[PDB]
PDB file of C-alpha atoms in Angstrom:
ATOM      1  CA  UNK H   1    -109.507  45.081  36.772  1.00  0.00           C
ATOM      2  CA  UNK H   2    -109.261  47.747  39.527  1.00  0.00           C
ATOM      3  CA  UNK H   3    -109.132  46.728  43.210  1.00  0.00           C
ATOM      4  CA  UNK H   4    -112.037  47.908  45.433  1.00  0.00           C
ATOM      5  CA  UNK H   5    -112.095  46.257  48.761  1.00  0.00           C
ATOM      6  CA  UNK H   6    -109.007  45.407  50.750  1.00  0.00           C
ATOM      7  CA  UNK H   7    -108.002  42.947  53.479  1.00  0.00           C
ATOM      8  CA  UNK H   8    -105.272  42.595  56.026  1.00  0.00           C
ATOM      9  CA  UNK H   9    -103.314  39.409  56.645  1.00  0.00           C
ATOM     10  CA  UNK H  10    -100.375  38.385  58.668  1.00  0.00           C
ATOM     11  CA  UNK H  11     -97.556  36.054  57.146  1.00  0.00           C
ATOM     12  CA  UNK H  12     -95.505  34.084  59.510  1.00  0.00           C
ATOM     13  CA  UNK H  13     -92.068  32.718  58.548  1.00  0.00           C
ATOM     14  CA  UNK H  14     -89.799  30.454  60.516  1.00  0.00           C
ATOM     15  CA  UNK H  15     -86.145  30.824  60.308  1.00  0.00           C
ATOM     16  CA  UNK H  16     -83.458  29.151  62.411  1.00  0.00           C
ATOM     17  CA  UNK H  17     -80.712  31.090  63.997  1.00  0.00           C
ATOM     18  CA  UNK H  18     -78.211  28.936  65.780  1.00  0.00           C
ATOM     19  CA  UNK H  19     -77.782  25.697  67.794  1.00  0.00           C
ATOM     20  CA  UNK H  20     -76.105  24.507  70.845  1.00  0.00           C
ATOM     21  CA  UNK H  21     -72.335  24.464  71.490  1.00  0.00           C
ATOM     22  CA  UNK H  22     -70.783  20.989  72.415  1.00  0.00           C
ATOM     23  CA  UNK H  23     -67.410  19.813  73.317  1.00  0.00           C
ATOM     24  CA  UNK H  24     -66.043  16.346  72.706  1.00  0.00           C
ATOM     25  CA  UNK H  25     -62.964  15.329  74.678  1.00  0.00           C
ATOM     26  CA  UNK H  26     -60.660  13.140  72.484  1.00  0.00           C
ATOM     27  CA  UNK H  27     -58.988  11.346  75.409  1.00  0.00           C
ATOM     28  CA  UNK H  28     -62.281  10.517  77.503  1.00  0.00           C
ATOM     29  CA  UNK H  29     -63.943   9.412  74.239  1.00  0.00           C
ATOM     30  CA  UNK H  30     -61.018   7.241  72.843  1.00  0.00           C
ATOM     31  CA  UNK H  31     -59.473   5.927  76.093  1.00  0.00           C
ATOM     32  CA  UNK H  32     -60.549   7.328  79.296  1.00  0.00           C
ATOM     33  CA  UNK H  33     -58.727   5.560  82.122  1.00  0.00           C
ATOM     34  CA  UNK H  34     -55.724   3.974  80.623  1.00  0.00           C
ATOM     35  CA  UNK H  35     -52.086   4.453  80.336  1.00  0.00           C
ATOM     36  CA  UNK H  36     -50.871   2.474  77.263  1.00  0.00           C
ATOM     37  CA  UNK H  37     -53.877   3.820  75.432  1.00  0.00           C
ATOM     38  CA  UNK H  38     -52.938   7.424  76.139  1.00  0.00           C
ATOM     39  CA  UNK H  39     -49.157   6.622  75.189  1.00  0.00           C
ATOM     40  CA  UNK H  40     -50.488   5.311  71.789  1.00  0.00           C
ATOM     41  CA  UNK H  41     -52.808   8.155  71.277  1.00  0.00           C
ATOM     42  CA  UNK H  42     -49.956  10.687  71.940  1.00  0.00           C
ATOM     43  CA  UNK H  43     -48.757   9.716  68.510  1.00  0.00           C
ATOM     44  CA  UNK H  44     -52.134  10.943  67.051  1.00  0.00           C
ATOM     45  CA  UNK H  45     -52.254  14.119  69.086  1.00  0.00           C
ATOM     46  CA  UNK H  46     -52.347  16.337  66.004  1.00  0.00           C
ATOM     47  CA  UNK H  47     -55.717  14.763  65.035  1.00  0.00           C
ATOM     48  CA  UNK H  48     -57.292  15.390  68.341  1.00  0.00           C
ATOM     49  CA  UNK H  49     -55.888  18.897  68.335  1.00  0.00           C
TER      50      UNK H  49
ATOM     51  CA  UNK E   1     -31.511  15.110  97.649  1.00  0.00           C
ATOM     52  CA  UNK E   2     -34.625  14.973  95.292  1.00  0.00           C
ATOM     53  CA  UNK E   3     -36.721  12.186  93.897  1.00  0.00           C
ATOM     54  CA  UNK E   4     -37.434  12.296  90.154  1.00  0.00           C
ATOM     55  CA  UNK E   5     -40.986  11.823  89.028  1.00  0.00           C
ATOM     56  CA  UNK E   6     -42.256  11.088  85.587  1.00  0.00           C
ATOM     57  CA  UNK E   7     -43.863  14.286  84.597  1.00  0.00           C
ATOM     58  CA  UNK E   8     -44.367  15.846  81.195  1.00  0.00           C
ATOM     59  CA  UNK E   9     -41.971  18.608  80.309  1.00  0.00           C
ATOM     60  CA  UNK E  10     -42.054  21.058  77.571  1.00  0.00           C
ATOM     61  CA  UNK E  11     -38.628  22.122  76.435  1.00  0.00           C
ATOM     62  CA  UNK E  12     -37.514  25.274  74.571  1.00  0.00           C
ATOM     63  CA  UNK E  13     -34.495  24.851  72.358  1.00  0.00           C
ATOM     64  CA  UNK E  14     -32.517  27.926  71.030  1.00  0.00           C
ATOM     65  CA  UNK E  15     -29.985  28.165  68.271  1.00  0.00           C
ATOM     66  CA  UNK E  16     -27.224  26.587  70.421  1.00  0.00           C
ATOM     67  CA  UNK E  17     -28.999  23.178  70.599  1.00  0.00           C
ATOM     68  CA  UNK E  18     -29.167  23.309  74.305  1.00  0.00           C
ATOM     69  CA  UNK E  19     -32.109  23.112  76.681  1.00  0.00           C
ATOM     70  CA  UNK E  20     -32.720  26.932  77.779  1.00  0.00           C
ATOM     71  CA  UNK E  21     -36.295  26.650  79.280  1.00  0.00           C
ATOM     72  CA  UNK E  22     -38.418  23.849  80.802  1.00  0.00           C
ATOM     73  CA  UNK E  23     -42.148  24.009  81.637  1.00  0.00           C
ATOM     74  CA  UNK E  24     -43.864  21.497  83.790  1.00  0.00           C
ATOM     75  CA  UNK E  25     -47.025  20.642  81.962  1.00  0.00           C
ATOM     76  CA  UNK E  26     -48.442  18.847  84.986  1.00  0.00           C
ATOM     77  CA  UNK E  27     -48.467  21.675  87.786  1.00  0.00           C
ATOM     78  CA  UNK E  28     -51.330  24.102  87.033  1.00  0.00           C
ATOM     79  CA  UNK E  29     -54.055  24.492  84.548  1.00  0.00           C
ATOM     80  CA  UNK E  30     -52.268  27.485  83.064  1.00  0.00           C
ATOM     81  CA  UNK E  31     -49.107  25.344  82.594  1.00  0.00           C
ATOM     82  CA  UNK E  32     -51.302  22.533  80.980  1.00  0.00           C
ATOM     83  CA  UNK E  33     -52.823  25.056  78.512  1.00  0.00           C
ATOM     84  CA  UNK E  34     -49.349  26.293  77.806  1.00  0.00           C
ATOM     85  CA  UNK E  35     -48.247  22.690  77.070  1.00  0.00           C
ATOM     86  CA  UNK E  36     -51.136  21.908  74.898  1.00  0.00           C
ATOM     87  CA  UNK E  37     -50.838  25.036  72.832  1.00  0.00           C
ATOM     88  CA  UNK E  38     -47.109  24.641  72.696  1.00  0.00           C
ATOM     89  CA  UNK E  39     -46.684  28.313  73.687  1.00  0.00           C
ATOM     90  CA  UNK E  40     -45.076  30.198  76.571  1.00  0.00           C
ATOM     91  CA  UNK E  41     -47.002  33.560  76.602  1.00  0.00           C
ATOM     92  CA  UNK E  42     -50.726  33.267  76.556  1.00  0.00           C
ATOM     93  CA  UNK E  43     -52.812  36.231  76.024  1.00  0.00           C
ATOM     94  CA  UNK E  44     -56.384  36.919  77.421  1.00  0.00           C
ATOM     95  CA  UNK E  45     -59.265  34.631  76.783  1.00  0.00           C
ATOM     96  CA  UNK E  46     -60.933  31.386  78.191  1.00  0.00           C
ATOM     97  CA  UNK E  47     -59.469  27.894  77.139  1.00  0.00           C
ATOM     98  CA  UNK E  48     -60.630  24.316  77.606  1.00  0.00           C
ATOM     99  CA  UNK E  49     -58.384  21.743  79.298  1.00  0.00           C
ATOM    100  CA  UNK E  50     -58.787  18.215  80.513  1.00  0.00           C
TER     101      UNK E  50
END
């Protein structure tokens, strides 16, 4: 088999690049507006860090 | 005469076991970043605080 005619086509491929940058505050998500909660979370500061 | 206030202070101890440097963690955003990173000489760059 020897090709005689020819055709032109366009192949489209979808590939992601990146996403969106987000920030989650540990204090605002766990306690927020409290003193004893913050004093107790101070012991778990390494986890939030 | 001065009135003491409950403020978070970061201390730097030397080889003699005595306090040689104190940083007020509640005074400026740079001081807050220094207290969070537990450092005293921050380089160049952006940082996230409270």
